[PDB]
mmCIF file of C-alpha atoms in Angstrom:
data_model
loop_
_atom_site.group_PDB
_atom_site.id
_atom_site.type_symbol
_atom_site.label_atom_id
_atom_site.label_comp_id
_atom_site.label_asym_id
_atom_site.label_seq_id
_atom_site.Cartn_x
_atom_site.Cartn_y
_atom_site.Cartn_z
ATOM 1 C CA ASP A 1 -13.875 63.303 46.018
ATOM 2 C CA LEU A 2 -10.990 64.744 47.968
ATOM 3 C CA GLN A 3 -9.539 61.278 47.987
ATOM 4 C CA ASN A 4 -11.850 60.022 45.234
ATOM 5 C CA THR A 5 -14.720 59.120 47.478
ATOM 6 C CA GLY A 6 -14.496 55.764 49.188
ATOM 7 C CA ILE A 7 -17.281 54.129 47.204
ATOM 8 C CA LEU A 8 -15.658 54.843 43.858
ATOM 9 C CA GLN A 9 -12.306 53.781 45.286
ATOM 10 C CA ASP A 10 -13.840 50.813 47.104
ATOM 11 C CA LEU A 11 -15.085 49.810 43.669
ATOM 12 C CA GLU A 12 -11.708 50.504 42.081
ATOM 13 C CA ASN A 13 -9.524 48.395 44.357
ATOM 14 C CA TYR A 14 -12.419 45.958 44.581
ATOM 15 C CA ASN A 15 -12.018 45.590 40.832
ATOM 16 C CA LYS A 16 -8.276 45.361 41.418
ATOM 17 C CA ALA A 17 -9.091 42.502 43.782
ATOM 18 C CA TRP A 18 -11.064 41.037 40.878
ATOM 19 C CA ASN A 19 -8.026 40.814 38.618
ATOM 20 C CA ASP A 20 -6.273 39.415 41.679
ATOM 21 C CA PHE A 21 -9.150 36.967 42.046
ATOM 22 C CA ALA A 22 -8.336 35.990 38.476
ATOM 23 C CA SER A 23 -4.752 35.490 39.676
ATOM 24 C CA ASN A 24 -5.783 32.733 42.076
ATOM 25 C CA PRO A 25 -9.392 31.913 43.018
ATOM 26 C CA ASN A 26 -8.011 28.967 44.978
ATOM 27 C CA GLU A 27 -6.369 31.675 47.101
ATOM 28 C CA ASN A 28 -9.502 32.253 49.154
ATOM 29 C CA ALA A 29 -8.149 35.525 50.550
ATOM 30 C CA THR A 30 -8.588 36.977 47.063
ATOM 31 C CA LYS A 31 -12.283 36.363 47.709
ATOM 32 C CA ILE A 32 -12.129 37.752 51.236
ATOM 33 C CA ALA A 33 -10.168 40.874 50.309
ATOM 34 C CA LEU A 34 -12.373 41.260 47.243
ATOM 35 C CA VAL A 35 -15.459 40.771 49.413
ATOM 36 C CA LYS A 36 -14.170 43.306 51.926
ATOM 37 C CA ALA A 37 -13.611 46.021 49.320
ATOM 38 C CA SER A 38 -17.255 45.704 48.308
ATOM 39 C CA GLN A 39 -18.193 45.574 51.986
ATOM 40 C CA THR A 40 -16.724 49.048 52.359
ATOM 41 C CA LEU A 41 -18.403 49.911 49.060
ATOM 42 C CA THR A 42 -21.866 48.756 50.117
ATOM 43 C CA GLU A 43 -21.697 50.022 53.686
ATOM 44 C CA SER A 44 -20.404 53.303 52.282
ATOM 45 C CA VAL A 45 -23.494 53.525 50.091
ATOM 46 C CA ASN A 46 -25.398 52.797 53.292
ATOM 47 C CA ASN A 47 -23.807 55.552 55.381
ATOM 48 C CA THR A 48 -24.126 58.200 52.674
ATOM 49 C CA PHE A 49 -27.821 57.344 52.479
ATOM 50 C CA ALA A 50 -28.126 57.922 56.217
ATOM 51 C CA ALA B 1 -20.631 -16.242 -5.080
ATOM 52 C CA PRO B 2 -18.398 -18.049 -7.615
ATOM 53 C CA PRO B 3 -17.330 -18.439 -10.369
ATOM 54 C CA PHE B 4 -14.921 -15.524 -10.926
ATOM 55 C CA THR B 5 -12.370 -14.234 -13.433
ATOM 56 C CA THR B 6 -8.942 -12.637 -13.432
ATOM 57 C CA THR B 7 -10.967 -9.477 -13.963
ATOM 58 C CA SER B 8 -12.035 -8.574 -10.443
ATOM 59 C CA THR B 9 -15.645 -9.523 -9.776
ATOM 60 C CA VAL B 10 -16.900 -6.985 -7.256
ATOM 61 C CA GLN B 11 -19.879 -6.818 -4.899
ATOM 62 C CA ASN B 12 -20.723 -4.156 -2.349
ATOM 63 C CA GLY B 13 -19.528 -4.489 1.213
ATOM 64 C CA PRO B 14 -20.841 -4.196 4.760
ATOM 65 C CA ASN B 15 -22.298 -1.254 6.636
ATOM 66 C CA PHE B 16 -20.348 -1.829 9.855
ATOM 67 C CA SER B 17 -17.632 -3.687 11.688
ATOM 68 C CA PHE B 18 -17.462 -3.766 15.462
ATOM 69 C CA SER B 19 -14.463 -5.945 16.249
ATOM 70 C CA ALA B 20 -12.005 -7.284 13.720
ATOM 71 C CA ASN B 21 -8.832 -9.183 12.932
ATOM 72 C CA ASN B 22 -7.633 -5.713 12.112
ATOM 73 C CA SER B 23 -4.957 -4.759 9.620
ATOM 74 C CA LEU B 24 -1.853 -3.143 11.098
ATOM 75 C CA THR B 25 -1.832 0.656 10.842
ATOM 76 C CA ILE B 26 1.094 2.932 11.554
ATOM 77 C CA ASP B 27 -0.182 6.300 10.381
ATOM 78 C CA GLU B 28 -2.698 8.658 11.959
ATOM 79 C CA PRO B 29 -3.254 12.340 12.704
ATOM 80 C CA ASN B 30 -4.010 11.533 16.336
ATOM 81 C CA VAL B 31 -1.889 10.961 19.454
ATOM 82 C CA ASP B 32 -1.953 9.047 22.727
ATOM 83 C CA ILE B 33 1.418 9.760 24.296
ATOM 84 C CA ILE B 34 1.373 7.427 27.295
ATOM 85 C CA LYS B 35 -0.279 4.408 25.684
ATOM 86 C CA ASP B 36 2.160 4.841 22.811
ATOM 87 C CA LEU B 37 5.151 4.963 25.167
ATOM 88 C CA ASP B 38 4.232 1.751 26.983
ATOM 89 C CA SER B 39 3.414 0.062 23.670
ATOM 90 C CA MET B 40 6.832 0.966 22.280
ATOM 91 C CA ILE B 41 8.382 -0.470 25.442
ATOM 92 C CA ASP B 42 6.598 -3.696 24.503
ATOM 93 C CA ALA B 43 8.291 -3.544 21.111
ATOM 94 C CA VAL B 44 11.647 -2.836 22.740
ATOM 95 C CA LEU B 45 11.593 -5.543 25.417
ATOM 96 C CA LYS B 46 11.099 -8.385 22.946
ATOM 97 C CA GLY B 47 12.745 -6.247 20.267
ATOM 98 C CA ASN B 48 9.952 -5.536 17.764
ATOM 99 C CA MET B 49 11.253 -3.655 14.783
ATOM 100 C CA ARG B 50 8.966 -5.890 12.675
ATOM 101 C CA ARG C 1 20.852 22.288 18.342
ATOM 102 C CA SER C 2 17.637 20.408 17.594
ATOM 103 C CA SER C 3 18.774 20.079 13.978
ATOM 104 C CA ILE C 4 22.143 18.684 15.069
ATOM 105 C CA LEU C 5 20.399 16.398 17.560
ATOM 106 C CA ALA C 6 18.869 14.751 14.483
ATOM 107 C CA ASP C 7 22.195 13.898 12.842
ATOM 108 C CA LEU C 8 24.511 13.329 15.794
ATOM 109 C CA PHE C 9 25.116 9.572 15.323
ATOM 110 C CA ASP C 10 24.303 8.755 11.693
ATOM 111 C CA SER C 11 24.532 5.032 11.055
ATOM 112 C CA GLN C 12 24.340 2.108 8.654
ATOM 113 C CA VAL C 13 22.373 -1.100 9.169
ATOM 114 C CA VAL C 14 23.349 -4.771 8.865
ATOM 115 C CA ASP C 15 21.030 -7.673 8.150
ATOM 116 C CA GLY C 16 20.739 -11.438 7.959
ATOM 117 C CA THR C 17 18.677 -14.468 8.998
ATOM 118 C CA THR C 18 21.411 -15.030 11.543
ATOM 119 C CA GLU C 19 22.457 -14.710 15.188
ATOM 120 C CA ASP C 20 22.073 -11.184 16.488
ATOM 121 C CA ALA C 21 24.696 -10.383 19.112
ATOM 122 C CA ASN C 22 24.403 -12.893 21.955
ATOM 123 C CA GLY C 23 25.728 -10.365 24.473
ATOM 124 C CA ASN C 24 22.651 -10.200 26.699
ATOM 125 C CA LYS C 25 20.734 -10.927 23.473
ATOM 126 C CA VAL C 26 19.956 -7.695 21.616
ATOM 127 C CA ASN C 27 16.981 -7.703 19.254
ATOM 128 C CA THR C 28 16.097 -4.845 16.893
ATOM 129 C CA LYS C 29 18.576 -4.178 14.032
ATOM 130 C CA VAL C 30 22.320 -4.480 13.583
ATOM 131 C CA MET C 31 24.172 -1.224 13.067
ATOM 132 C CA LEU C 32 27.452 0.614 13.166
ATOM 133 C CA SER C 33 27.421 4.274 14.064
ATOM 134 C CA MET C 34 29.262 7.356 15.218
ATOM 135 C CA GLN C 35 28.445 6.007 18.632
ATOM 136 C CA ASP C 36 30.852 3.237 17.533
ATOM 137 C CA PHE C 37 33.397 4.826 15.176
ATOM 138 C CA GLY C 38 35.480 6.058 18.097
ATOM 139 C CA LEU C 39 32.860 8.710 18.862
ATOM 140 C CA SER C 40 30.120 8.550 21.470
ATOM 141 C CA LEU C 41 27.538 10.480 23.463
ATOM 142 C CA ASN C 42 27.607 12.047 26.886
ATOM 143 C CA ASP C 43 24.561 13.322 28.661
ATOM 144 C CA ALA C 44 24.875 17.049 27.921
ATOM 145 C CA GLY C 45 23.875 16.587 24.271
ATOM 146 C CA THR C 46 27.623 16.407 23.853
ATOM 147 C CA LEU C 47 30.043 14.091 22.088
ATOM 148 C CA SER C 48 32.729 11.745 23.404
ATOM 149 C CA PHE C 49 35.471 10.030 21.451
ATOM 150 C CA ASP C 50 38.420 7.653 21.279
ATOM 151 C CA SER D 1 24.027 -2.578 21.080
ATOM 152 C CA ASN D 2 20.453 -2.969 22.314
ATOM 153 C CA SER D 3 20.987 -6.055 24.458
ATOM 154 C CA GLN D 4 17.880 -6.892 26.490
ATOM 155 C CA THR D 5 19.664 -5.275 29.425
ATOM 156 C CA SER D 6 20.280 -2.332 27.108
ATOM 157 C CA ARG D 7 16.675 -2.508 25.905
ATOM 158 C CA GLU D 8 15.588 -2.399 29.530
ATOM 159 C CA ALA D 9 18.276 0.194 30.242
ATOM 160 C CA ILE D 10 17.200 2.414 27.340
ATOM 161 C CA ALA D 11 13.613 1.939 28.499
ATOM 162 C CA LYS D 12 14.520 3.170 31.985
ATOM 163 C CA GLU D 13 15.193 6.535 30.372
ATOM 164 C CA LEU D 14 11.608 6.516 29.112
ATOM 165 C CA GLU D 15 10.160 6.107 32.601
ATOM 166 C CA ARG D 16 12.237 9.112 33.648
ATOM 167 C CA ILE D 17 10.914 10.854 30.546
ATOM 168 C CA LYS D 18 7.515 9.542 31.632
ATOM 169 C CA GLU D 19 8.104 10.640 35.224
ATOM 170 C CA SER D 20 9.313 14.107 34.240
ATOM 171 C CA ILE D 21 6.415 14.650 31.839
ATOM 172 C CA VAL D 22 4.053 13.571 34.609
ATOM 173 C CA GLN D 23 5.831 15.948 36.985
ATOM 174 C CA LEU D 24 5.616 18.917 34.648
ATOM 175 C CA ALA D 25 2.023 18.009 33.770
ATOM 176 C CA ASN D 26 1.018 17.916 37.439
ATOM 177 C CA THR D 27 3.079 21.047 38.172
ATOM 178 C CA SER D 28 1.140 23.068 40.758
ATOM 179 C CA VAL D 29 2.356 26.545 39.883
ATOM 180 C CA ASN D 30 0.392 29.063 41.995
ATOM 181 C CA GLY D 31 -1.562 26.013 43.151
ATOM 182 C CA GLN D 32 -2.853 25.159 39.672
ATOM 183 C CA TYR D 33 -1.887 21.827 38.193
ATOM 184 C CA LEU D 34 -1.113 23.943 35.195
ATOM 185 C CA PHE D 35 -2.753 21.676 32.617
ATOM 186 C CA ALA D 36 -5.741 19.811 34.067
ATOM 187 C CA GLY D 37 -7.614 20.890 30.976
ATOM 188 C CA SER D 38 -8.836 24.349 31.797
ATOM 189 C CA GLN D 39 -9.624 22.902 35.244
ATOM 190 C CA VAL D 40 -5.941 23.246 36.120
ATOM 191 C CA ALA D 41 -6.642 23.530 39.865
ATOM 192 C CA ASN D 42 -6.932 19.762 40.508
ATOM 193 C CA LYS D 43 -5.290 16.501 39.498
ATOM 194 C CA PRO D 44 -4.735 16.333 35.709
ATOM 195 C CA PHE D 45 -3.209 12.891 35.378
ATOM 196 C CA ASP D 46 -1.509 9.813 36.751
ATOM 197 C CA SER D 47 1.646 8.099 35.501
ATOM 198 C CA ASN D 48 -0.360 5.721 33.290
ATOM 199 C CA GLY D 49 -1.856 8.281 30.910
ATOM 200 C CA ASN D 50 -5.190 8.369 32.749
#
């Protein structure tokens, strides 16, 4: 976790994007940025597996 | 039915009313701001204090 | 300020089965007030006088 | 003082009161019509109290 590993940080800022999503769901980018942070999260689970 | 006396002769009333020649109420917990406002304008235009 | 806004133009009422002021035909109640005793309102929640 | 012109005049404040209240009700801060129930993200009202 030199740089707390991406997945745990992907989750973190992803959850930051969540509170942002609470700021304005009508701001679709909150979804997209939120979605992206998980995308790194999930794909990072995927690469570690490999 | 008659006859009656100065002592009030009483007899139990109805279950329901649905439309009525209603008495005039000015007191209620409730509120309807806009319908009130326009109604008071009606009083003002012709000048209803009574 | 809200408290003062209650009292700003205290008044007395006049009555009679008579002709309310014909000037563009008011209809509500006859009064004299601190809007009339030399003093008056201006829009800032402020007073005006002569 | 409430001549019918005055009674209309004084009314014409109420519409502005009505207009303002409608404005602030429909206020789309951060996109949300801040008070469409909890569904603040879409039209809460019209001018006529609907």
